[PDB]
Amino acid sequence: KVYVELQELVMDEKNQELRWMEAARWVQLEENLGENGAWGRPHLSHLTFWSLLELRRVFTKGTVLLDLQETSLAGVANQLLDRFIFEDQIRPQDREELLRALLLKHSHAGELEALGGVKPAVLTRSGDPSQPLLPQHSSLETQLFCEQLEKIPPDSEATLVLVGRADFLEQPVLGFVRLQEAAELEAVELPVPIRFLFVLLGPEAPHIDYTQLGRAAATLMSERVFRIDAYMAQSRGELLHSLEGFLDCSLVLPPTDAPSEQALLSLVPVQRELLRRRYQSSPAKPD
Amino acid sequence: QMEEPAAHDTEATATDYHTTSHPGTHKVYVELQELVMDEKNQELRWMEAARWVQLEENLGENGAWGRPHLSHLTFWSLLELRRVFTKGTVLLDLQETSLAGVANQLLDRFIFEDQIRPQDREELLRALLLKHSHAGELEALGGVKPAVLTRSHSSLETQLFCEQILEKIPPDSEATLVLVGRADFLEQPVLGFVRLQEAAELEAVELPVPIRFLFVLLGPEAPHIDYTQLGRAAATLMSERVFRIDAYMAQSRGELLHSLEGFLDCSLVLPPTDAPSEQALLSLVPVQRELLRRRYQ
């Protein structure tokens, strides 16, 4: 198995300092963090259509740093912003602000009650954190699973997903980093080395929920076939191919005014066949 | 004459065709038809592929309708359906009562919006006016194979549900006909959405209930485009209550796009997850229940 962490750039309430607070964690099954500061019940990950659309669009023109020689969040951020500017994903004037954001304090659930909670924020051109302009949507996962760690294998390597809003961006950008050697980072408190880093930054745009975008990226990384492909991927094209297979074997459930268990249980052959096709091209077998 | 005037997108007189009549609430029956070839005569014809009454039933290669099921959609289906809806050609409150008239007006509007070239019109009209056959004639037709329209593997649902009607239709029901075909002489896929001014019993396509809506989806073979699955997506969209009400009340393509984007906002994707199928599917029940709390209020 694997461990994945999702961190969203947010502001605290006491000092109004923007920072990184983890929002959800994955060990196959997804756990979510409530506003109280406790973890919600573990559940199978369900993704929204817009999140997967947006993830595919940003991954198609994404920035991959495979077998990367770094062992620090600062160094990984430096090389990532360098390859961002080289690919013209961000303007060079934004490197200072993006690097300032990436190396903030990465808080965890153990300091939520110590602080005054976290609120969504957008990075600005200056060093001051602003308030989002788009209408807000309280997390459906928070409303559903949160209102109420020994499973990690010793040899597993963690994955860190960072989602943040910065209004000084032309378009959302994705930087996917695989380290050559798994390293421990100050962002993750758990004693598991980090192998993959997802960095998803961009401006406030319609149909873009960066929490849902990070949830989609973390669910994709928690998928066994994409993880195995990512460990052996030597180019962005192979990761895009794995994402294409992931979307091919996905099941989209349209809305209906007659929700029923029996009607939903008629899709068992569909789910089994999609799993079979997903694991057909993989070296691994389904558990 | 000499002039070939370029179409001018104008909405100054658009509100002059917005009726004051509030549409009635009708349940929908949807029929998906595909462009196929029959082995007996090698003649192009339209064949029943699936129907929606309360659930989806697909037609197998034995003439027997498979097990009813919930209508699942592929990701590429909704992607491409949004793509063709954004540039779609809409004829809302069309004062037509025959398939020939609907097809002629739709092709004229296709040419007006630069969706098809004038040289494609005659072949598209020839295709749209072909014989519309039903599941009963299939056994007498000596089988059916899919076909592509030229200028001159089985579907997942069939393999999962088909290898092994009038009573169920509510009295005040209107039909939606979804026409799906492959035409290699088209540059891009085109979507034609038609709402008739009043429901009609088209002689060319006999249905259990009068037709109110027509979905026309044609195009060439393209990456990530399964036209059968695109027709399934359009039919599933029409079977949903909120989109059907919005389509009854729509006066422009933009309102239809807004309804479709809301439909996608309330759509849930299950990724490939190695959990057992029953638990993985039944976990969608509370998520769907919370997601659809406000949609049907």
Resolution (A): 2.7
* Cα pseudo-dihedral B133, B135, B140, B146, rounded to 10: 70
DSSP letter assigned to residue A232: T
Q: Are B49 and B58 in contact (CB under 8 A)?
A: yes
DSSP single-letter state for residue A61: T
Least Cα separation, residue A37 to chain B (angstroms): 22
Structure-block tokens of residue A9: 């750039």
Cβ within 8 Å of residue A48, ≥6 positions away: A209, A212, A216, B265, B267, B268, B269
> Which residue is associated with the tokens 């895009």?
A240
Q: Do B272 and A278 touch (CB under 8 A)?
A: yes
Nearest residue to A128 via CA among A72, A183, A168, A156: A168
Whether residues B267 and A250 touch (CB distance < 8 A) is answered with: no
Give CA separation, A33 vs A105, A148, B237, in Å.
18, 11, 34
Specify the residue for token string 């540059």: B187
Handedness of CA B151, B156, B159, B160 (dihedral sign): negative
Domain ranges (residues) in chain B? 14-292
Question: Nearest CA of chain A to the CA of B258: how many Å?
Answer: 12
The CA-based angle B204-B209-B210, given to 5 degrees, is 60
Q: What is the C-alpha separation between B283 and B215, in angstroms, rounded?
A: 33
Contacts of B77 in chain A (CB under 8 A): 252
CATH number among 3.40.50.300, 3.40.140.80, 3.40.50.920, 3.40.930.10, domain A1-275: 3.40.930.10
Q: How far is the C-alpha of B133 from the C-alpha of A76, rounded, in Å?
A: 63
Place of tokens 């989602």: A163
Experimental approach taken: cryo-EM
CATH architecture of B14-292: 3-Layer(aba) Sandwich (3.40)
Contact A138, A146 (CB under 8 A): no
A122's tokens? 């957008």
Q: Quick check: B43 and B145 in contact, CB under 8 A?
A: no
Alpha carbon of A222: minimum distance to chain B alpha carbons (Å) = 10
**Three-class HEC string of A244-264:** HHHHHCCEEECCCCCCCHHHH
CA angle B287, B292, B297 (to 5 degrees): 150
Neighbouring residues of B153: CB distance < 8 A, sequence distance ≥ 6: none
Q: Which residues lie closer than 8 Å to A82 by C-beta, 6 or more apart?
A: none
Contacts of A221 by beta carbon, 8 Å cutoff, 6+ apart: A2, A4, A26, A159, A161, A196, A198, A227, A230
Contact B78 A286 (CB under 8 A): no
Question: Strand pairing partners for B148?
Answer: B182
Q: Between chains, do B54 and A287 touch, taking CB under 8 Å as contact?
A: no
Question: Around Cβ A53, how many Cβ atoms within 10 Å?
Answer: 21
Separation of alpha carbons A40 and B162, rounded Å: 41
Say how far apart CA A173 and CA A163 lie, in whole Å.
10
Contacts of A2 in chain B (CB under 8 A): none
Inter-chain residue contact B54 with A275, CB threshold 8 Å: no
Helical segments of B87-167, H only:
99-112, 118-128, 135-140, 156-157
Distance separating alpha carbons of residues B244 and B84, to the nearest angstrom:
18
Q: Tell me which chain A residue has its CA closest to the CA of residue B54.
A: A258
Cβ-contact A241, B255 below 8 angstroms: no
Query: Would the CB atoms of B242 and A255 count as touching at under 8 Å?
Result: yes
Question: What's the alpha-carbon Rg for chain A, to the nearest Å?
Answer: 19
Is B106 exposed, middle or buried, given 0-12, 13-18 or 19+ CB atoms closer than 10 A? buried
Direct distance between the N- and C-terminal alpha carbons of chain A, in angstroms, rounded to an integer: 11
Amino acid at B280: A
Token match 């097809």: residue?
B103
Across-strand partners of A123?
A129, A166
